[PDB]
Symmetry: C2
Subunit: 42 residues, 2 copies
């Protein structure tokens, strides 16, 4: 395991927080979902 | 702008590096692309 940095402008971060919160999840959860979803589709 | 951490296992990180290399982009590019694609799909 390692940790990479993600740079987020404040609008995107608010969006991520809003999308995550409405389904009882967190920004970190969402970002991992996004990444895996993306790599799967490949 | 602010910076958030993302925890990645080696398998996922290799996938990311390989996928991005195929299209002449970087891991950072790919991750932002994944995030935005995901946000757009939720709706
Ligand atoms: Cl879950
Ligand atoms: Cl591009």
């Amino acid at each position: 395991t390692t940790t990479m940095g993600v740079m987020l402008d404040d609008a995107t971060r608010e969006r991520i927080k809003s999308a995550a919160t409405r389904i009882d999840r967190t920004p970190h959860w969402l970002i991992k979902q996004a990444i895996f979803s993306y790599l799967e589709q490949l």
